[PDB]
């Protein structure tokens, strides 16, 4: 199975809400809620990838962010390594820049069952902040 490195951004506003998008029906992890992000490309770093991915997907440039968690997860047909960056400062206003559903969701209300199973420990850890 293929192996992927994925960088994602946990976009947290001052009201303890996270900007969450919903994956397309024909995507891997179809219809799941997700932190915006995507594949780290050859020649770019995990830090550069989360910036580029958030610019492409939601129209913001994250800045002064931190690595919240890094973990590996084995899906039925692929192995991924996820870099979860906590993004508390950014330029712009996040939106569905690729036409995808996005909205702000209270951290306390997040349901890990709505996200890919790889996100379980991250969602739990976020709720302890
Ligand atoms: N974006 C994102 N992906 C996640 C999360 N949790 C999780 O297991 N994944 C998995 C689902 C996918 O297998 C992979 C993310 O790839 P992606 O489909 O977002 O990649 P991408 O935007 O670069 O896709 P592409 O169209 O550029 O090829 O990581 C998450 O919170 N956010
Ligand atoms: O790896 C993130 C980690 O590095 C620090 C500096 O110790 O921040 C640097 O890296 C971030 C990610 O590229 C930048 O956004 C930031 O501006 C830079 O100082 C820590 O703040 C952070 O935990
Ligand atoms: Mn993506
Ligand atoms: Na991508």
């Amino acid at each position: 199975m293929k192996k992927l490195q994925i960088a994602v951004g946990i976009i947290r506003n001052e009201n303890n809400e996270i900007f969450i998008t919903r994956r397309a029906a024909d995507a891997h992890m179809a219809n799941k809620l997700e932190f915006p992000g995507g594949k780290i490309e050859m020649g770019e770093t995990p830090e550069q990838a989360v910036v580029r991915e958030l610019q492409e997907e939601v129209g913001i440039t994250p800045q002064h962010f931190s690595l919240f968690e890094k973990l590996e997860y084995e899906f039925p047909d692929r192995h991924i390594t996820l870099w979860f960056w906590l993004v508390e400062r950014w330029e712009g206003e996040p939106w569905g820049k690729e036409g995808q559903p996005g909205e702000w969701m209270s951290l306390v209300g997040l349901n890990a069952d709505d996200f890919p199973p790889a996100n379980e420990p991250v969602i739990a850890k976020l709720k302890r902040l």
Side-chain angles (χ1 to χ4, degrees), residues 76-95:
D77 74 342
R78 64 198 69 193
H79 183 96
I80 71 170
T81 300
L82 281 148
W83 299 70
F84 295 88
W85 300 93
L86 179 59
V87 176
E88 292 165 322
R89 172 181 277 287
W90 59 86
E91 173 178 339
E93 188 70 43
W95 66 292

Side-chain angles (χ1 to χ4, degrees), residues 5 39-49 52:
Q5 302 283 318
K39 292 157 184 161
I40 302 169
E41 300 174 356
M42 180 71 62
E44 99 190 324
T45 66
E47 299 94 333
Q48 289 167 333
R52 179 187 51 74

Side-chain angles (χ1 to χ4, degrees), residues 36-103:
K39 292 157 184 161
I40 302 169
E41 300 174 356
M42 180 71 62
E44 99 190 324
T45 66
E47 299 94 333
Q48 289 167 333
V50 73
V51 167
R52 179 187 51 74
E53 285 291 341
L54 268 49
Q55 289 166 340
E56 291 179 16
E57 291 199 348
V58 303
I60 69 175
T61 296
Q63 52 204 202
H64 190 59
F65 53 91
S66 58
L67 186 61
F68 189 75
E69 183 67 281
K70 178 184 164 186
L71 59 81
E72 287 182 326
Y73 191 85
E74 190 190 331
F75 285 102
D77 74 342
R78 64 198 69 193
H79 183 96
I80 71 170
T81 300
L82 281 148
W83 299 70
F84 295 88
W85 300 93
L86 179 59
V87 176
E88 292 165 322
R89 172 181 277 287
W90 59 86
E91 173 178 339
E93 188 70 43
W95 66 292
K97 178 172 171 176
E98 293 179 346
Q100 80 277 38
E103 64 193 2

